[PDB]
RNA sequence: GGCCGGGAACUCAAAGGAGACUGCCAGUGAUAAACUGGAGGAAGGUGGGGAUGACGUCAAGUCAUCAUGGCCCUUACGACCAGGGCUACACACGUGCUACAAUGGCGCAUACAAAGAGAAGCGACCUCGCGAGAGCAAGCGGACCUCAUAAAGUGCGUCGUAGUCCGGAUUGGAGUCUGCAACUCGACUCCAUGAAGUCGGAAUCGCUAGUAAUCGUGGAUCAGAAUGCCACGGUGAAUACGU
């Protein structure tokens, strides 16, 4: 209904993006259960550090993908206004699906 | 063993086999493809298989249908 | 108990006895006993003379002993006469399936010599 | 182990009987880090020991172990180009440690069926001494007394 | 009111409850002997309940997930000691000596580059 | 990294949509246990460089045919040069 | 059957904090630094582990990843394409896997993981085949769905010291899968065959605690070939008197 799932890579970026959506909704409206933390997927890669030879020496890499879920339980015609296009997107992906 | 259903062969070499039956066999044909397999229609026809230098005269025989053309041309020379 | 082939085992299981003969092993040994209706755990001791011929008939269907020895050898001898890659690979004493002859070919090639 | 002296960490005791001595014994017998299959052999050996000998449970293996305790051992010097063996009094912590090792090593050389049986046969011939562990315990002792010179 | 205690042992989370009733052991809707605990780690669940006046003292419901045999067993060991909050901070002072309240900080080591598993450096040719 | 091999690669990739992909529907559903005729297997006289799993998948910057990760689409040497200059988002020194 | 209201405690999950600083106490020490011991505490003396590799050395490696001085070829050392080789074989060495077995083999039954990966993809459930797999074919861009039925271990039975139900090499016959294509030169399965080896000379390698060792799973690479590598967990020691 208002099931919105986010994605962000940074250790603290979405925490401020998922803050502003809460107090915007619950002020004029009601309910709004809040941000679910969700399990972080971590894609761990390993590549050779030297351009030639050197099997023992390598560099390890990781990309942490942090998810969040909004969950607004109240679909009012007032709270749907001032929700869309006040997000001010800082590269945070947003999706509207069940 | 391999190739599942149907014996896979090359198109261009099938025309050379049909040339040897219809127009008749004359000399050993110089073929670069080792991918095709021997059939009953290829029995009693002279063929030649390339293997890194020049085409070796491989004579076809009744019981060679079970194996490929590539087996009869050794690539690596020894001694 | 002669039991078809010349090999005569005794004081062991029926599953062990059938594996000892040429051209028959652990998989077929279950199928021969299951066909006749015989248990795996029963020994050769305490077994009737009429009960022997049922197992003797089933093992006699598939080619075994010296007939299968030459069946594989004739297919090798035929394959060597074809003048193929695998044919020259048999007679010279090297691996036929395409293993590394550089090192660890000691089974098919044979012991090290000067 | 140059500067840093150890804390000598304590293992947990044997859960059935409550003997801390048998907790070290099961660890020597253990191979591939399998404590479950290790104790199954040890308990099977101990039940056959007390039944055959007709003695009590806890003191059957204890008196058997007491006979295979080494009196003294030697240490390799290598100081002035020549190898010297100097005899030294083994400590009570090391005494049973080497004893439990030489029981398993002696049982390993046998040609018997099960590990429970062959180890129990080694425990059976510990009180009256014909075995391999009792031959193994007296090795440095023959070299000792001669090496009493160096002290 | 119920009496709670968590505990865990090598990524094996457990949840212990204690009530005043009968001495039956319920674990994941199964008995203690029917939880296969015959060999080593048979009575490590009742290790913190060794030195107490028991007879038939308490109900218990325990549920553990993660790890293997001894990982789940040692989680119940540390889990019951936290669940002694019925008896509160009186009986823990004697339990300090045993060291069952101590949560074990030993965890499995990460695999390292150029090593076979965490420590073992693979061998090399002569000198 | 030998720009002719990259020119050979750009050719190889550019034939994937034309000869196969669309007209590679032949041999998938058609060559199966149905109802045989061998004339469908005689359609393999096509140029062959269009093949769906032919490409080595070279690095897009340099053209090294080694250490190519599908995620980044770059070779191991260009991963370290890129990663230490940022550019890949949420990427840093992995330690746990 | 958490399966369905519902309850939100808790496990799990991850944003922000507290906590461990020789600080509280005792002793020793130039009264200072510090050390030993004890209390409290989940964690005590850099808590465990990782990232973090000084100035420089070996004119160490990489002109073959790229960049680039100079030199050289330039109707060729360039370019395109077929096939071949990179997988050869009287030999020598290193690095691994699987073993030589009753702490084990084989068969039936049964319990407990974590870390992952997935749309040109991972593939339920169902039917067919002894099997590898094939056809039909939901769900999920992913705490849902899929790979995934983890194995050691444990419960009974068989085997009772043999070149064996130990070990799997090698070879033959007959199959599946990926792809224009498996002969040189594959993975995997089916039947059959069952080399050597029964603890390995001198010598040599690693490791001080969830470590050695042992048993499994996953990923990157990749259409399709791991016993390598990387990542994860299960069981789990011995011995450290000393320099
Ligand atoms: Mg260039
Ligand atoms: Mg390729
Ligand atoms: Mg630092
Ligand atoms: Mg240099
Ligand atoms: Mg075998």
Torsion of Cα atoms, D123 then D127 then D128 then D134, to 10°: 60
The nucleotide closest to F46 (CA, C1' atoms): G180
Ordered alpha helix ranges (H), chain D? 20-29, 35-53, 58-67, 92-108, 115-124, 133-137, 140-143
Helix, strand or coil, per DSSP, at residue A25: helix
Whether chain E has a CB inside 8 Å of the CB on A56: the answer is yes
Spatial separation of the C-alpha atoms in residues C17 and C28, rounded to whole Å: 12
Helix (H) or strand (E) holding B31: strand B29-31
Structure tokens at E122: 């693979």
Which of D17, D33, D29 lies closest to D122, judged by CA?
D29
Say whether E114 and A46 touch across the interface (CB within 8 A). Answer: no
Helix, strand or coil, per DSSP, at residue B12: helix
Q: What is the DSSP track for A47-88?
A: EESSSSS-SS-EEEEEEEEEEEE-------TTTSTTTTT-S-
Phi, psi of C4 (to 5 degrees): 60, -80
Listed as ranges, the nucleotides of chain G within 7 A of a protein C-beta are: 9-16, 40-44, 47-52, 61-62, 64-66, 78-96, 102-104, 111-118, 120, 134-135, 141-143, 150-155, 157-161, 164-165, 169-187, 190-195, 204-215, 220-223, 229-243
Structure tokens at D112: 């018997």
Q: What is the DSSP track for D15-27?
A: TTT--HHHHHHHH
Query: Using a CB cutoff of 8 Å and minimum separation of 24, what contacts does D124-133 make?
Result: D124/D49, D124/D52, D124/D53, D126/D63, D126/D64, D126/D65, D126/D67, D126/D68, D127/D53, D127/D63, D127/D64, D127/D67, D129/D67, D131/D106, D132/D106, D132/D107, D133/D68, D133/D102, D133/D103, D133/D105, D133/D106, D133/D107
Say whether E40 and D35 touch across the interface (CB within 8 A). Answer: yes
Spatial separation of the C-alpha atoms in residues F72 and F51, rounded to whole Å: 23
Task: Calculate how far, in angstroms, residue F63's C-alpha sits from the geometric centre of ligand 1.
Answer: 10
Structure tokens at A72: 């607004």
Residues whose CB falls within 8 Å of the CB of residue C74, separated by 6 or more in sequence, listed in order: none
CB-based burial of residue F33 (10 Å sphere; 0-12 exposed, 13-18 middle, 19+ buried)?
A: exposed
Residues whose CB falls within 8 Å of the CB of residue C78, separated by 6 or more in sequence, listed in order: B63
Residues of A in contact with F77 (CB under 8 A): 48, 51
Resolution of the model in angstroms: 3.7
Residue ranges making up the domain that contains B1: 1-79
Phi-psi region of E50 (alpha: psi -120 to 50; beta: other; left: phi over 0): alpha
Say whether A47 and F93 touch across the interface (CB within 8 A). Answer: no
Spatial separation of the C-alpha atoms in residues C7 and C50, rounded to whole Å: 19
Domain ranges of chain F: 1-86
Tell me the CB-side half-sphere exposure of residue C58, using CA atoms within 13 A: 17
Phi-psi region of E113 (alpha: psi -120 to 50; beta: other; left: phi over 0): beta
**Residue the block writes with tokens 């062990």:** C16
- What does the longest C-alpha to C-alpha distance in chain D come to? 55
Say whether F93 and A60 touch across the interface (CB within 8 A). Answer: yes
Which residue, counting CA atoms, is nearest to the C1' of nucleotide G230? A46
Asked whether the beta carbons of E3 and E86 are under 8 A apart, the reply is yes
Whether chain F has a CB inside 8 Å of the CB on A37: the answer is no
The per-residue b/e assignment along C43-79, b for 16 or more CB within 10 angstroms, e otherwise, is: ebeeeeeeeeeebeebbeeeebeeeeeeeeeeeeeeb
**Stretch 8-37 of chain B: residues touching chain F, C-beta under 8 Å:** 8, 11-12, 14
Give the number of domains in chain B. Answer: 1
The nucleotide closest to E14 (CA, C1' atoms): G11
Task: Calculate how far, in angstroms, residue C14's C-alpha sits from the geometric centre of ligand 5.
Answer: 17
Say whether C78 and B72 touch across the interface (CB within 8 A). Answer: no
Residues with CB under 5 A from ligand 2 (ion): F 56
Say whether C78 and B63 touch across the interface (CB within 8 A). Answer: yes
Give the number of domains in chain E. Answer: 1
Spatial separation of the C-alpha atoms in residues E37 and E44, rounded to whole Å: 10
**Residue the block writes with tokens 């309240």:** E101
Helix, strand or coil, per DSSP, at residue E16: strand
β-pairing, E59-65 vs E25-27, is parallel
Interchain contact D/B (3 or more Cβ pairs less than 8 Å): no
What distance, in Å, lies between the first and last C-alpha atoms of chain C?
Answer: 49
For domain C2-65, the question of CATH label 1.10.8.50 is answered with yes
Phi-psi region of E99 (alpha: psi -120 to 50; beta: other; left: phi over 0): left
Phi-psi region of E126 (alpha: psi -120 to 50; beta: other; left: phi over 0): left
The nucleotide closest to E17 (CA, C1' atoms): G10
CB-based burial of residue F65 (10 Å sphere; 0-12 exposed, 13-18 middle, 19+ buried)?
A: middle
The nucleotide closest to F5 (CA, C1' atoms): G79
Nearest CB partner across the interface for F80, out of A9, A43, A59: A59
The nucleotide closest to A3 (CA, C1' atoms): G144
Integer CA distances (angstroms), C78 to A55, B48, B57, C72, C81, in order: 49, 22, 20, 10, 5
Helix, strand or coil, per DSSP, at residue D112: coil
Which residue, counting CA atoms, is nearest to the C1' of nucleotide G92? C103
Interface of D with E (CB under 8 A): 15, 35-36, 39-40
Give the neighbor-by-neighbor strand order of the sheet with B46-49: B29-31, B46-49, B56-59
Whether chain F has a CB inside 8 Å of the CB on B5: the answer is yes
Class of D20-147 in CATH:
mainly alpha
Find the closest chain D residue to E46 by CA distance.
D15
Domain ranges of chain D: 20-147
Integer CA distances (angstroms), F71 to A50, F52, F53, F94, in order: 21, 19, 17, 17
Asked whether the beta carbons of D39 and D26 are under 8 A apart, the reply is yes
Spatial separation of the C-alpha atoms in residues B28 and B47, rounded to whole Å: 5
Helix (H) or strand (E) holding E62: strand E59-65
Which of E37, E40, E3 lies closest to E19, judged by CA?
E3
Residue E112 Cα, gap to closest chain A Cα (Å): 10
Helix, strand or coil, per DSSP, at residue D47: helix
DSSP designation for E24: -
Spatial separation of the C-alpha atoms in residues A32 and A26, rounded to whole Å: 6
Spatial separation of the C-alpha atoms in residues D97 and D109, rounded to whole Å: 19
Asked whether the beta carbons of C36 and C54 are under 8 A apart, the reply is yes
Separation of CA F63 and C1' G92 in angstroms? 39
User: Residue length, chain A?
Assistant: 98
Say whether A61 and F91 touch across the interface (CB within 8 A). Answer: yes
Residue ranges making up the domain that contains E76: 1-127
Give the number of the ligand closest to the Cα of residue C25: 5
């Amino acid at each position: 209904r208002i099931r919105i799932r986010l994605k962000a890579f940074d250790h603290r970026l979405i925490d401020q993006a998922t803050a502003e959506i809460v107090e915007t909704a619950k002020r004029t409206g009601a309910q709004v259960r809040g941000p679910i933390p969700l399990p972080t997927r971590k894609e761990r890669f390993t590549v050779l550090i030297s351009p030639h030879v050197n099997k023992d020496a390598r560099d390890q890499y990781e990309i942490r993908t942090h998810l969040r879920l909004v969950d607004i339980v109240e679909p009012t015609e007032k709270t749907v206004d001032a929700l869309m296009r006040l997000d001010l997107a800082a590269g945070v992906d947003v999706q509207i699906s069940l | 063993r391999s190739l599942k259903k149907g014996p896979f062969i090359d198109l261009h070499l099938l025309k050379k086999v049909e040339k040897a039956v219809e127009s008749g066999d004359k000399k050993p044909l110089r073929t670069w493809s080792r991918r095709s397999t021997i059939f009953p229609n290829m029995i009693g026809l002279t063929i030649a298989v390339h293997n890194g230098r020049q085409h070796v005269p491989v004579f076809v025989t009744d019981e060679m249908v079970g194996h490929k053309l590539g087996e009869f041309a050794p690539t690596r020379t020894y001694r | 108990a002669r039991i078809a082939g010349i090999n005569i085992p005794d004081h062991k299981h029926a599953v062990i006895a059938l594996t000892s003969i040429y051209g028959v092993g652990k998989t077929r040994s279950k199928a021969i006993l299951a066909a006749a209706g015989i248990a795996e755990d029963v020994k050769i001791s305490e077994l009737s003379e009429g009960q022997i011929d049922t197992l003797r008939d089933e093992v006699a269907k598939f080619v075994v002993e010296g007939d299968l020895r030459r069946e594989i050898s004739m297919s090798i001898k035929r394959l060597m006469d074809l003048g193929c890659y695998r044919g020259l690979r048999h007679r010279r004493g090297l691996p036929v399936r395409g293993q590394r002859t550089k090192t660890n070919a000691r089974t098919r090639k044979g012991p090290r010599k000067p | 182990p140059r500067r840093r002296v150890i804390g000598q960490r304590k293992i947990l005791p044997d859960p059935k009987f409550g003997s801390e001595l048998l907790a070290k014994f099961v660890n020597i017998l253990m191979v591939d880090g399998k404590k479950s299959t290790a104790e199954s052999i040890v308990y099977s050996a101990l039940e056959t020991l007390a039944q055959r000998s007709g003695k009590s449970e806890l003191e059957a293996f204890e008196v058997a172990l007491e006979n295979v305790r080494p009196t003294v051992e030697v240490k390799s010097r290598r100081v002035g180009g020549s190898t010297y063996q100097v005899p030294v009094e083994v400590r009570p912590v090391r005494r049973n440690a080497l004893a439990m090792r030489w029981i398993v090593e002696a049982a390993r050389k046998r040609g018997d069926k099960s590990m429970a049986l062959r180890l129990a046969n080694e425990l059976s011939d510990a009180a009256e001494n014909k075995g391999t562990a009792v031959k193994k315990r007296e090795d440095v002792h023959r070299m000792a007394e001669a090496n009493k010179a160096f002290a | 009111n119920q009496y709670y205690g968590t505990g865990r042992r090598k990524s094996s989370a457990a949840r212990v409850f204690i009530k005043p009733g009968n001495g039956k052991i319920v674990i994941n809707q199964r008995s203690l002997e029917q939880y296969f605990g015959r060999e080593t780690a048979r009575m490590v669940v009742r290790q913190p309940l060794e030195l107490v006046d028991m007879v038939e003292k308490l109900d218990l419901y325990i549920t553990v997930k993660g790890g293997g045999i001894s990982g789940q067993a040692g989680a119940i060991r540390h889990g019951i000691t936290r669940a002694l909050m019925e008896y509160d901070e009186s009986l823990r002072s004697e339990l300090r000596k045993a060291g069952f309240v101590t949560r074990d900080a030993r965890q499995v080591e990460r695999k390292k580059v150029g090593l076979r598993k965490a420590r073992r450096r693979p061998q090399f040719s002569k000198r | 990294a030998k720009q002719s091999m990259k020119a050979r690669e750009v050719k190889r990739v550019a034939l994937a949509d034309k000869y196969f992909a669309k007209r590679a529907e032949l041999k998938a559903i058609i060559s199966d246990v149905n109802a045989r005729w061998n004339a469908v297997l005689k359609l393999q006289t096509l140029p062959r460089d269009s093949s769906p799993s032919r490409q080595r998948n070279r690095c897009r910057q340099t053209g090294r045919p080694h250490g190519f990760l599908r995620k980044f689409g770059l070779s191991r040497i260009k991963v370290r040069e890129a990663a230490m200059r940022g550019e890949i988002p949420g990427l840093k020194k992995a330690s746990w």
